[PDB]
Each structure stands twice: as C-alpha cells, then as structure tokens.
Design an enzyme around this catalytic site. Structure first.
Site, PDB file in Angstrom:
ATOM      1  N   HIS A  40       0.859  -1.202   0.000  1.00 14.74           N
ATOM      2  CA  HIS A  40       0.000   0.000   0.000  1.00 14.74           C
ATOM      3  C   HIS A  40       0.878   1.228   0.000  1.00 14.74           C
ATOM      4  CE1 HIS A  40       0.225   0.445   4.543  1.00 14.74           C
ATOM      5  NE2 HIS A  40       0.031   1.710   4.166  1.00 14.74           N
ATOM      6  N   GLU A  52      19.676   6.883   7.422  1.00 19.34           N
ATOM      7  CA  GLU A  52      19.042   8.085   7.903  1.00 19.34           C
ATOM      8  C   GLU A  52      18.795   8.043   9.392  1.00 19.34           C
ATOM      9  OE1 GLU A  52      18.461  10.780   6.598  1.00 19.34           O
ATOM     10  OE2 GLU A  52      17.683  10.687   4.548  1.00 19.34           O
ATOM     11  N   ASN A  54      17.912  11.931  11.136  1.00 22.14           N
ATOM     12  CA  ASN A  54      17.055  13.026  10.849  1.00 22.14           C
ATOM     13  C   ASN A  54      16.781  13.057   9.340  1.00 22.14           C
ATOM     14  OD1 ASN A  54      16.028  15.669  10.285  1.00 22.14           O
ATOM     15  ND2 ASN A  54      16.594  16.275  12.381  1.00 22.14           N
ATOM     16  N   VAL A  57      17.841  16.547   7.567  1.00 20.54           N
ATOM     17  CA  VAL A  57      19.193  17.101   7.676  1.00 20.54           C
ATOM     18  C   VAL A  57      20.157  16.068   7.101  1.00 20.54           C
ATOM     19  CG1 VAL A  57      20.958  17.914   9.340  1.00 20.54           C
ATOM     20  CG2 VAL A  57      18.552  18.355   9.792  1.00 20.54           C
ATOM     21  N   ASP A  84      -0.060  -7.456   1.988  1.00 23.49           N
ATOM     22  CA  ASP A  84       0.456  -6.070   1.953  1.00 23.49           C
ATOM     23  C   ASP A  84       1.959  -6.116   2.054  1.00 23.49           C
ATOM     24  OD1 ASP A  84       0.620  -3.353   1.778  1.00 23.49           O
ATOM     25  OD2 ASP A  84      -0.135  -2.983   3.846  1.00 23.49           O
ATOM     26  N   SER A 172       2.228   1.985  16.098  1.00 22.84           N
ATOM     27  CA  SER A 172       2.696   2.654  14.901  1.00 22.84           C
ATOM     28  C   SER A 172       1.574   3.492  14.338  1.00 22.84           C
ATOM     29  CB  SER A 172       3.287   1.663  13.931  1.00 22.84           C
ATOM     30  OG  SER A 172       2.340   0.706  13.508  1.00 22.84           O
ATOM     31  N   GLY A 175       2.617   7.061   8.137  1.00 23.25           N
ATOM     32  CA  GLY A 175       3.976   7.395   7.839  1.00 23.25           C
ATOM     33  C   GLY A 175       4.992   6.372   8.293  1.00 23.25           C
ATOM     34  N   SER A 177       4.083   3.208   7.849  1.00 24.19           N
ATOM     35  CA  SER A 177       3.715   2.163   6.933  1.00 24.19           C
ATOM     36  C   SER A 177       4.899   1.684   6.124  1.00 24.19           C
ATOM     37  CB  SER A 177       2.661   2.702   6.000  1.00 24.19           C
ATOM     38  OG  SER A 177       1.423   2.803   6.682  1.00 24.19           O
ATOM     39  N   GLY A 178       4.970   0.358   5.922  1.00 19.74           N
ATOM     40  CA  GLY A 178       6.044  -0.266   5.177  1.00 19.74           C
ATOM     41  C   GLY A 178       7.248  -0.566   5.979  1.00 19.74           C
TER      42      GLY A 178
HETATM   43 CA   LIG Z   1      19.515  12.702   7.145  1.00 15.50          CA
END
Ligand SMILES: [Ca+2]
Length: 223
Positions: A40, A52, A54, A57, A84, A172, A175, A177-178
């Site tokens: 989805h 990652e 942040n 940034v 899904d 959760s 955002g 999701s996945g």
């Molecule tokens: Ca970053």
C-alpha cells in the site's frame, strides 16, 4: 510511532525511508540490493534513503539510491490489505557498514507474546498530527490471533498479525507504513494498517512476513 522513544542515530541500520520528494513510508533493507516494504506504500519514482536518522538534515551517513524496480505481491488486495508486501530493487548495491545493514528474514513465524521493535518516521500523536524528524522506536508484543480477530472481526487473514497494547497509547501510525517489525533479530512484520493510532481496542495490524519468504526468495532469484 505514538508512545515510542528516539531510537538513537543509526541504531536500526536496516530501516530505510522511501522518498518521492518527501518521506512517505518506511522499509527494511534485506540485502545490499533489496528492500521489503508494504504494497500500500507503492508510488512511482521512489528513492530509497538508507543510513538516515534526521530525514530533514544531511548528517553524513546517508546513502540515497533510486529504485530500479518495485514488485507488489501478485495477490495484494488493496481493499482488504491482504498480502500487503512489496519488494523494491535498488539501482546500485548499498555499501554495507555499521550504520547501513540488512535484517535477516525469518525461518519460523514469531511467537505470540514476543516483544518486537517497530520503528519509523510516522505520526507521533494519537489525536492530531506531529511528524518527527528523527527515527522513533517502539517495543510492542505480538498479540494473540484470537485477540486480533476480536479486535477486527471479519478482517484478519492468516497473512496478518496484531501487535501493541489494547489499552491504547502505544502504536505505529501513518507514515510508519512499510517499515519493520523485528522480533528475535528477524523481520517478522511490516507496518500495514489499524483503526486510527494507539486507540483502545484497536491495535496495529502487520503483514506476516514469514508467510512470504518463498516468494521473496524466488523473486530476488529472478530479478
Ligand atoms: Ca539525514
């Protein structure tokens, strides 16, 4: 993630952010070339962002790699969210290091009651909206199938499990999701759906990754 904690930079080194001009979903790095996410979360034009913390940034440990291919499960049904799951191939292999690392796929399904680690950049509010910049984490137990079916009658298939806290407050959310649900060092779930976030009697629902290991292996053997 509602009711979670700041993970700590790069301590969830398999967590990816999927970006189409903005973060829109999580995913999990399963080897240098492949990410597992939710069907989805499909979008055209995905850039996978690894390393990652942040997401707003550049901190110095990121690898940004375009997707070359996305493969939604053959039997994904967007109406029921059954199956899904999606694979995303990277255009180039990630450089694996202390901050960018793969997560093992399961051999066996996870036990009910197991405490798992769920992570993501999704909403942190149960009522209203606040999206964090740094990665959030939550420890949450797998709920029994009976409890999950009671919570969402007629809607839970064998390819789904519930996890979280029936009293509300920790889940959760949009955002996330996945992204991953990791239990005993294996990717056992993908953030999939739920009614609201962190609401009483409405736990999170997750794709049951151990039902997909043969499809993941034959797909990656072939693409
Ligand atoms: Ca970053």
């Amino acid at each position: 993630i509602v009711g979670g904690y700041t993970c700590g930079a790069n301590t969830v080194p398999y967590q990816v952010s999927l970006n189409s001009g903005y973060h829109f979903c999580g995913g999990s790095l399963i080897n240098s070339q492949w990410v597992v996410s939710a069907a989805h979360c499909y979008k055209s034009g995905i850039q996978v962002r690894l390393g990652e913390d942040n997401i707003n940034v550049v901190e110095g440990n990121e690898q940004f790699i375009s997707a070359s291919k996305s493969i939604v499960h053959p039997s994904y049904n967007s109406n029921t969210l059954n199956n899904d799951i999606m694979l995303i191939k990277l255009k180039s292999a990630a450089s694996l290091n202390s901050r960018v690392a793969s997560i093992s796929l399961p051999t066996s399904c996870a036990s009910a009651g197991t405490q798992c680690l769920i992570s993501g950049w999704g909403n942190t509010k149960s009522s209203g909206t606040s999206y964090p910049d740094v990665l959030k984490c939550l420890k949450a137990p797998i709920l029994s199938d009976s409890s999950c079916k009671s919570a969402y009658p007629g809607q839970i298939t064998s390819n789904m499990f519930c996890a979280g806290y029936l009293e509300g407050g920790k889940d959760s959310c949009q955002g996330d999701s996945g992204g991953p649900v990791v239990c005993s060092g294996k990717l056992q779930g993908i953030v999939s759906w739920g009614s609201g976030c962190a609401q009483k009697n409405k736990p999170g629902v997750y794709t049951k990754v151990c039902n997909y290991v043969s499809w993941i292996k034959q797909t990656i053997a072939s693409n």
